[PDB]
Amino acid sequence: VCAEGFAPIPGEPHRCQLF
Numbered sequence: 001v002c003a004e005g006f007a008p009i010p011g012e013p014h015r016c017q018l019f
Contacts, residue, residue: 006016 002016005019007019009015009017
C-alpha cells in the first residue's frame with residue numbers, strides 16, 4: 001500500500017511514485 005496519489009513501480013513492486 002502507500003499514500004493518496006501513489007501506486008506500485010514498473011519492474012520494481014516495493015516502493016511508490018505518482019498516482
